[PDB]
Design an enzyme around this catalytic site. Structure first.
Site, PDB file in Angstrom:
ATOM      1  N   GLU B  58       0.830  -1.191   0.000  1.00  0.00           N
ATOM      2  CA  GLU B  58       0.000   0.000   0.000  1.00  0.00           C
ATOM      3  C   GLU B  58       0.873   1.253   0.000  1.00  0.00           C
ATOM      4  OE1 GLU B  58      -2.095   1.334   3.473  1.00  0.00           O
ATOM      5  OE2 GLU B  58      -3.896   1.756   2.316  1.00  0.00           O
ATOM      6  N   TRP B  80      -8.212  -2.447  -0.771  1.00  0.00           N
ATOM      7  CA  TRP B  80      -8.926  -1.276  -1.279  1.00  0.00           C
ATOM      8  C   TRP B  80     -10.048  -1.664  -2.247  1.00  0.00           C
ATOM      9  CZ3 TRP B  80      -9.327   3.772  -0.152  1.00  0.00           C
ATOM     10  CH2 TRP B  80      -8.354   4.347   0.678  1.00  0.00           C
ATOM     11  N   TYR B  94      -4.805   9.774  -1.627  1.00  0.00           N
ATOM     12  CA  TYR B  94      -3.448   9.760  -1.072  1.00  0.00           C
ATOM     13  C   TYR B  94      -2.262  10.072  -2.004  1.00  0.00           C
ATOM     14  CZ  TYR B  94      -5.918   7.919   2.923  1.00  0.00           C
ATOM     15  OH  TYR B  94      -6.790   7.742   3.972  1.00  0.00           O
ATOM     16  N   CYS B 146      -8.319   9.573   5.446  1.00  0.00           N
ATOM     17  CA  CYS B 146      -8.381   9.351   6.894  1.00  0.00           C
ATOM     18  C   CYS B 146      -7.063   9.821   7.512  1.00  0.00           C
ATOM     19  CB  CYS B 146      -8.635   7.879   7.232  1.00  0.00           C
ATOM     20  SG  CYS B 146     -10.163   7.177   6.563  1.00  0.00           S
ATOM     21  N   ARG B 166      -7.712  12.009  10.833  1.00  0.00           N
ATOM     22  CA  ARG B 166      -8.981  12.645  11.155  1.00  0.00           C
ATOM     23  C   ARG B 166      -9.996  11.627  11.650  1.00  0.00           C
ATOM     24  NH1 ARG B 166     -13.314  11.269   8.024  1.00  0.00           N
ATOM     25  NH2 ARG B 166     -12.688  10.327   6.031  1.00  0.00           N
ATOM     26  N   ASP B 169     -10.368   3.984  12.616  1.00  0.00           N
ATOM     27  CA  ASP B 169     -10.928   2.671  12.863  1.00  0.00           C
ATOM     28  C   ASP B 169      -9.877   1.951  13.710  1.00  0.00           C
ATOM     29  OD1 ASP B 169     -11.762   0.010  12.778  1.00  0.00           O
ATOM     30  OD2 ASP B 169     -12.193   0.054  10.619  1.00  0.00           O
ATOM     31  N   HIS B 207     -12.331   5.645  17.047  1.00  0.00           N
ATOM     32  CA  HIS B 207     -13.508   4.834  17.293  1.00  0.00           C
ATOM     33  C   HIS B 207     -13.298   3.324  17.140  1.00  0.00           C
ATOM     34  CE1 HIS B 207     -13.660   6.051  13.012  1.00  0.00           C
ATOM     35  NE2 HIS B 207     -13.921   4.766  12.862  1.00  0.00           N
TER      36      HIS B 207
HETATM   37  C1  LIG Z   1      -7.811   1.809   6.003  1.00  0.00           C
HETATM   38  N1  LIG Z   1      -9.030   2.011   5.205  1.00  0.00           N
HETATM   39  C2  LIG Z   1     -10.289   1.804   5.875  1.00  0.00           C
HETATM   40  C3  LIG Z   1     -11.516   1.888   5.075  1.00  0.00           C
HETATM   41  N2  LIG Z   1     -12.849   1.634   5.710  1.00  0.00           N
HETATM   42  C4  LIG Z   1     -12.932   1.293   7.161  1.00  0.00           C
HETATM   43  N3  LIG Z   1     -14.229   1.047   7.783  1.00  0.00           N
HETATM   44  N4  LIG Z   1     -11.649   1.194   8.000  1.00  0.00           N
HETATM   45  C5  LIG Z   1     -10.367   1.441   7.393  1.00  0.00           C
HETATM   46  O1  LIG Z   1      -9.198   1.377   8.197  1.00  0.00           O
HETATM   47  N5  LIG Z   1     -11.431   2.253   3.648  1.00  0.00           N
HETATM   48  C6  LIG Z   1     -10.146   2.280   2.921  1.00  0.00           C
HETATM   49  C7  LIG Z   1      -8.996   1.624   3.747  1.00  0.00           C
HETATM   50  C8  LIG Z   1      -8.450   0.248   3.264  1.00  0.00           C
HETATM   51  N6  LIG Z   1      -7.486  -0.231   4.262  1.00  0.00           N
HETATM   52  C9  LIG Z   1      -7.756  -1.472   4.993  1.00  0.00           C
HETATM   53  C10 LIG Z   1      -6.644  -2.047   5.961  1.00  0.00           C
HETATM   54  C11 LIG Z   1      -6.914  -3.429   6.708  1.00  0.00           C
HETATM   55  C12 LIG Z   1      -8.268  -4.189   6.467  1.00  0.00           C
HETATM   56  C13 LIG Z   1      -8.468  -5.561   7.144  1.00  0.00           C
HETATM   57  O2  LIG Z   1      -9.352  -6.285   6.792  1.00  0.00           O
HETATM   58  N7  LIG Z   1      -7.343  -6.083   7.944  1.00  0.00           N
HETATM   59  C14 LIG Z   1      -7.422  -7.451   8.508  1.00  0.00           C
HETATM   60  C15 LIG Z   1      -6.790  -8.457   7.487  1.00  0.00           C
HETATM   61  C16 LIG Z   1      -5.371  -7.966   7.064  1.00  0.00           C
HETATM   62  C17 LIG Z   1      -5.116  -8.441   5.609  1.00  0.00           C
HETATM   63  O3  LIG Z   1      -5.591  -9.762   5.467  1.00  0.00           O
HETATM   64  O4  LIG Z   1      -5.792  -7.590   4.708  1.00  0.00           O
HETATM   65  C18 LIG Z   1      -6.626  -7.439   9.822  1.00  0.00           C
HETATM   66  O5  LIG Z   1      -7.256  -7.997  10.952  1.00  0.00           O
HETATM   67  O6  LIG Z   1      -5.754  -6.643   9.952  1.00  0.00           O
HETATM   68  C19 LIG Z   1      -9.386  -3.612   5.486  1.00  0.00           C
HETATM   69  C20 LIG Z   1      -9.122  -2.239   4.747  1.00  0.00           C
HETATM   70  O1  LIG Z   2      -6.123   5.569   7.179  1.00  0.00           O
HETATM   71  C1  LIG Z   2      -6.933   4.467   6.874  1.00  0.00           C
HETATM   72  N1  LIG Z   2      -7.485   3.884   8.177  1.00  0.00           N
HETATM   73  C2  LIG Z   2      -8.508   4.800   8.830  1.00  0.00           C
HETATM   74  O2  LIG Z   2      -8.891   4.297  10.095  1.00  0.00           O
HETATM   75  N2  LIG Z   2      -9.657   4.984   7.941  1.00  0.00           N
HETATM   76  C3  LIG Z   2     -10.917   4.445   8.408  1.00  0.00           C
HETATM   77  C4  LIG Z   2     -11.546   5.295   9.525  1.00  0.00           C
HETATM   78  C5  LIG Z   2     -13.018   5.400   9.175  1.00  0.00           C
HETATM   79  O3  LIG Z   2     -13.802   4.616  10.033  1.00  0.00           O
HETATM   80  C6  LIG Z   2     -13.162   4.871   7.746  1.00  0.00           C
HETATM   81  C7  LIG Z   2     -13.763   5.991   6.891  1.00  0.00           C
HETATM   82  O4  LIG Z   2     -14.857   6.519   7.599  1.00  0.00           O
HETATM   83  P1  LIG Z   2     -15.251   8.117   7.443  1.00  0.00           P
HETATM   84  O5  LIG Z   2     -14.815   8.694   5.958  1.00  0.00           O
HETATM   85  O6  LIG Z   2     -16.701   8.266   7.609  1.00  0.00           O
HETATM   86  O7  LIG Z   2     -14.462   8.941   8.622  1.00  0.00           O
HETATM   87  O8  LIG Z   2     -11.821   4.558   7.262  1.00  0.00           O
HETATM   88  C8  LIG Z   2      -9.446   4.562   6.579  1.00  0.00           C
HETATM   89  C9  LIG Z   2      -8.070   4.982   5.988  1.00  0.00           C
HETATM   90  F1  LIG Z   2      -7.915   4.528   4.699  1.00  0.00           F
END
Ligand SMILES: CN1c2c(nc(N)[nH]c2=O)NC[C@@H]1CNc1ccc(C(=O)N[C@@H](CCC(=O)O)C(=O)O)cc1
Ligand SMILES: O=c1[nH]c(=O)n([C@H]2C[C@H](O)[C@@H](COP(=O)(O)O)O2)cc1F
Ligand SMILES: CN1c2c(nc(N)[nH]c2=O)NC[C@@H]1CNc1ccc(C(=O)N[C@@H](CCC(=O)O)C(=O)O)cc1
Ligand SMILES: O=c1[nH]c(=O)n([C@H]2C[C@H](O)[C@@H](COP(=O)(O)O)O2)cc1F
Lengths: 260, 263
Positions: B58, B80, B94, B146, B166, B169, B207
């Protein structure tokens, strides 16, 4: 009780020496955070008399989307004189990015209105943000944004605000910045049907200039008096507030302290 | 120290129940700060297995200025997938802001290059900043950034980095973000001839999704183990790094924990 003061000390004592450009020897730390509970009192420092008049008029200036220091002089404020062109122009700074960021559509985006709208219709949004940091326009600015970026947050109908300041003149700058955003937070909250929560100050380079080491030694010796109270008149719109609509009640600051 | 785990416990225990865009639920806190001393170890979490290959690819993808997931698939990374158009496009997110933020005149600003420069040439500068939050272009993005922007800072030949995020997760995203920026920092430090300092993580909305809570409890019952070490091979440009160059040592995490993402 005294977030600012604690941070000032900690930077005087732990801070690392470092040159800037231009100026003298600063002691410096990176990535520091102060926290204020706005319901507990307005954070206008009591350990030294802060020039609130300048703070207010400046914010109103920012909210006017004003780039020139004319309207500022009209009210006897001169804190910006030292970077203003013969014409009094400063470039597309704070107010300009806040009120009319130049999108690639030719549109101008009013971030303040957009933020306030979010607060009213979608309080839980995590995108309630304002950014003065416009990469495309930094070099047209007399000076790149110091307090560059801020965000709002709602919890139990209480408005919090976190600011990100990249560069922080702790003794002469930050006091203004604290009150300033504190005021802004009262204004957005008032306009949006909310109460005040927290003000969170997050700094990048946090520095006490070389001169100021003495000015600062005094200020840390003084005992902190109880905070003043902020009052606002009613207005239909954030952009209609005037200086006369603002009151700071029961402010009893230790005497001022000058410094360049 | 376990700053990630402390924050997680703290939000779980004291967070405010809240609604959100994703239609799930959350406990939330605002304005929280994690701090890592990168010289004591690479902050790849050990209370669960974090998939570094994905974090690393990434990052390399951001650096390419790329907004199409195709290259990520070329390397098996799929994180993604559920935000891209049918052509695999995500909008000017990004990397596109990092490598080519479009100015009013039209010109693309390369912030990563700009930053290195300032580091090699003027380490004391307080303007070493990279921003993804292009007000002008956010509507155009599949999602708004984010991890919104970051600053670099030098002292005694040590490179520090503070990120403003900002929206956090906590369980699913943040462990990725911590590793990623720690990785970038090592990279920027190698290329500027510096050692690593601190990584400082500053969050807006922090959160824990309501459907991640049994996972958060499992994770929090585990005993933290020492962080691993990061080894970077030499390159002449931050833009020439490859996964091959990015090696982790002594990483023994507790088992991975699966969790459903909130779209
Ligand atoms: C960060 N981002 C993000 C999002 N949407 C939410 N709700 N939370 C996020 O953190 N939209 C775009 C993006 C994509 N990044 C991610 C990063 C990890 C995982 C996840 O599933 N991690 C698991 C498996 C790791 C690997 O197998 O992918 C883990 O428990 O870490 C999903 C999306
Ligand atoms: O930097 C990464 N990880 C981060 O935690 N967000 C998560 C936070 C949020 O819960 C979600 C997007 O939600 P929102 O746009 O409503 O803040 O992606 C995603 C990015 F790619
Ligand atoms: C904030 N800014 C700033 C800077 N440069 C430095 N070193 N510090 C700063 O805070 N460049 C641009 C800008 C202009 N703003 C300011 C704000 C207050 C004062 C200052 O002198 N305050 C006095 C009161 C005197 C004033 O009311 O005329 C004080 O001790 O508070 C100077 C410049
Ligand atoms: O909101 C103000 N407060 C702040 O302290 N800066 C200070 C930080 C720095 O010391 C100087 C800007 O110079 P530089 O671009 O090098 O950080 O002004 C100025 C802003 F206007």
């Amino acid at each position: 009780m005294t977030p600012y003061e604690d941070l000032l000390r900690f930077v005087l004592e732990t801070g690392t020496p470092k040159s800037d450009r231009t100026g003298t020897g600063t002691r410096s730390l990176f990535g520091q955070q102060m926290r204020y509970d706005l319901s507990a009192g307005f954070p206008l420092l009591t350990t030294k008399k802060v020039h609130f008049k300048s703070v207010a008029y400046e914010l109103l200036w920012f909210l006017r989307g004003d780039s020139n220091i004319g309207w500022l002089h009209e009210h006897g404020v001169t804190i910006w004189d030292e970077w203003a062109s013969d014409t009094g122009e400063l470039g597309p700074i704070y107010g300009v990015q806040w009120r009319s960021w130049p999108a690639p559509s030719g549109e101008h985006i009013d971030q303040i209105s957009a933020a306030l709208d979010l607060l009213r219709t979608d309080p839980d949004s995590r995108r309630i943000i304002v950014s003065a940091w416009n990469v495309g326009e930094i070099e047209r600015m007399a000076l790149p944004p110091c307090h560059a970026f801020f965000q709002f947050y709602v919890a139990d109908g209480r408005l919090s605000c976190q600011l990100y300041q990249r560069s922080a003149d702790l003794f002469l700058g930050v006091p203004f910045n604290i009150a300033s955003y504190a005021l802004l937070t009262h204004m957005m909250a008032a306009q949006a049907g909310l109460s005040v929560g927290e003000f969170i100050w997050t700094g990048g380079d946090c520095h006490i200039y070389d001169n100021h080491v003495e000015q600062v030694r005094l200020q840390l010796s003084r005992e902190p008096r109880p905070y003043p109270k902020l009052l606002l008149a009613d207005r239909d719109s954030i952009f209609e507030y005037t200086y006369e609509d603002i009151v700071v009640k029961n402010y009893d600051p230790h005497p001022a302290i000058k410094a360049p």
